[PDB]
A paper describes a structure:
The [name] (M pro) of coronaviruses plays a key role in viral replication, thus serving as a hot target for drug design. M pro is able to process polyproteins to produce several nonstructural proteins (NSPs) necessary for viral replication. The recognition site of coronaviral M pro depends on Gln at the P1 position, and no proteases in humans share a similar cleavage site. PF-00835231 is an inhibitor designed for the [name] of [name]-CoV that emerged in 2003, but its clinical trials were suspended due to the rapid disappearance of the [name] outbreak.
We then used the co-crystallization method to determine the crystal structures of several M pro mutants of [name]-CoV-2 in complex with PF-00835231. The resolutions for these structures are 1.79 Å (M pro G15S with PF-00835231)A, 1.68 Å (M pro K90R with PF-00835231), 1.65 Å (M pro M49I with PF-00835231), 1.72 Å (M pro [name] with PF-00835231), 1.64 Å (M pro S46F with PF-00835231), 1.66 Å (M pro V186F with PF-00835231) and 1.91 Å (M pro Y54C with PF-00835231), respectively. In each of these seven complex structures, each [name]-CoV-2 M pro mutant molecule appears as a dimer form, which is also the form with enzymatic activity. The details of the interaction between M pro [name] and PF-00835231 show that PF-00835231 interacts with several residues, including His41, Phe140, Cys145, His163, His164, Glu166, and Gln189. PF-00835231 was not found to interact with Phe140 in M pro G15S or M pro [name] and was not found to interact with Thr190 in M pro mutants. In fact, the G15S, K90R, and [name] mutations are located far from the PF-00835231 binding pocket. The results clearly showed that the ligand binding patterns are not disrupted by these mutations. The IC 50 value of PF-00835231 against [name]-CoV-2 M pro was 0.0086 μM, while the IC 50 value of PF-00835231 against [name]-CoV-2 M pro mutants, including K90R, M49I, G15S, V186F, [name] and Y54C, ranged from 1.2 to 3.7 μM.
Numbering used by the authors:
A (entry chain A): 3 to 301
B (entry chain B): 3 to 300
Amino acid sequence: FRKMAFPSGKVEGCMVQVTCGTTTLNGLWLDDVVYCPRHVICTSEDMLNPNYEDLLIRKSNHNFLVQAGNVQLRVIGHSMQNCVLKLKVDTANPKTPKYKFVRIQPGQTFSVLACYNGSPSGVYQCAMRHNFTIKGSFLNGSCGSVGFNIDYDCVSFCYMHHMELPTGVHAGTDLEGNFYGPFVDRQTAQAAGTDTTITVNVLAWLYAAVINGDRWFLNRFTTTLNDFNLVAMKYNYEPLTQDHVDILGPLSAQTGIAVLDMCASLKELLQNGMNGRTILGSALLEDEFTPFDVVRQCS
Amino acid sequence: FRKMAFPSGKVEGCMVQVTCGTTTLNGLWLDDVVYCPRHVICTSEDMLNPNYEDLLIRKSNHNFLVQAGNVQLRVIGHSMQNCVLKLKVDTANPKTPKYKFVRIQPGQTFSVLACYNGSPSGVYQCAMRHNFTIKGSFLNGSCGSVGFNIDYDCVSFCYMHHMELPTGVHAGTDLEGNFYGPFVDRQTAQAAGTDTTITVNVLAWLYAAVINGDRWFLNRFTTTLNDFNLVAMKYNYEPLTQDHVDILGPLSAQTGIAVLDMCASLKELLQNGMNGRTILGSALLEDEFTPFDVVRQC
Ligand SMILES: *[C@@](O)(CO)[C@H](C[C@@H]1CCNC1=O)NC(=O)[C@H](CC(C)C)NC(=O)c1cc2c(OC)cccc2[nH]1
Ligand SMILES: *[C@@](O)(CO)[C@H](C[C@@H]1CCNC1=O)NC(=O)[C@H](CC(C)C)NC(=O)c1cc2c(OC)cccc2[nH]1
């Protein structure tokens, strides 16, 4: 079981670079709009304490350099939506895929296409942590890189990169410019909330073990969802939502193990430990495979 | 610090589906040639012990159905090079990238674009292990998926997928059709040689952990190269060469930890264990990052 990204080609064809003054980052070119982080309009000094509505009044269309490779796309309009800038360009991208903009929940995974100067560099899978950070791999010039899932050739864009925290994890927005978590696009040291283990994904991992014949941890007990949530919080595990219970439905049906029965097995694991045993070869419980990832790989 | 694959778009544009009778797998369409595993010509019966030259002479161009998304490509010629079939088509692939075929050495990494029915499905990083297997994620229908590296828009293809061993590791060929390792394209259970750990990669990864602010495994000791290799061979690690020491130079300079100091640290980890602790999130010593992988990403 390994972390697999989606093929990145459909997103590669949408990556551009956006420069204002000397400040350069990446943008996403879909139809005749380029989406990028709004702090491109800031000078290094401005980012310390920017007033974005005031910085944007000073900008005109002709202040924006949008390039696909070294080919300039002329900007014919601009607007600000939350923390993203939308630049209307005179050319509709012929490589635009079928797409949607979606806001994901904590625990969900997505592929990140890390980009520099408009040029894709690498691709890897990330999980949104419950403190709304991702454990990415980003260097200077990576802002505007995007995260996505692909469902039957439709690209659901869910992340645009803005920030590296002092702890080394990363934070960003959806494609409507709304940050995940309590972060702000200022050049300031911000701290994330305490992380928690992603319970719904640990349960997915346990189903994956069962599918593969590794089922020693299945016990004879069950639990209510409220009782489980109150115990889980004492082990720094996230409480389950109704949506979590329902996305475990397919794996529960496939194995015949009720969701709440698996919760009872996890509860026993948390209270008593692995006792030196392993699950899928590992002494650690994995929390960055979603139920979707598990079926995506298992079947 | 993450296992990071190359962007796969240049390879996606080359994946096609190849069908012979009841048998289907993936092919790689470059210019006017489709490369695919030769066992596509085998029925279930043939695959137990196939005489590939005999089976191929009995095939016609029309026996090969090649589909690129929706379009069907007319096969106008075919030849076999070792375990790889080369289907000449009457259409050149307009999306062919600048490319090369290379054969990689153990320890080197590459990106895998896992495909099913000629449609790309996922991308992830693999390393060619010392026993010439790879730890991949491949299901039924994945044969003909390829591995590659990308250097300034040139795709260097190094792997075509053929088989999953009983242990769950994977085996395949270069794009000349020569297997990595002692494996053969017959429907049999095959074991690999002993899996020595790629030492220079474990050391590169320990440097990655320091560059990302983790030092708990460092120590005040040093070791000679030979004394380290004695311990390495005892734990079935590959002996470290002076070329390996040289390749680790940049990470040592960037970090200020001499290579032999990091070897003393790895020696301690091999002798004491990790004592329940973790490095870069891993409970195990990671051996699938090369020194270049660490430099490029950091
Ligand atoms: C984008 O590339 C910027 O356009 C960049 C990406 C990060 C650089 C290193 N890795 C990354 O992911 N973003 C930034 O530099 C942002 C810019 C803001 C939103 C205006 N700033 C930070 O990520 C940032 C600032 C500070 C800081 O200050 C002082 C102190 C500590 C951490 C920190 N991160
Ligand atoms: C291909 O896709 C075939 O076109 C398939 C890929 C594997 C299936 C499951 N995961 C994979 O990576 N490859 C095979 O099925 C090959 C075909 C050979 C080369 C003709 N066979 C095996 O991988 C294989 C056969 C046997 C076996 O026999 C008996 C016993 C144990 C393991 C095993 N693997």
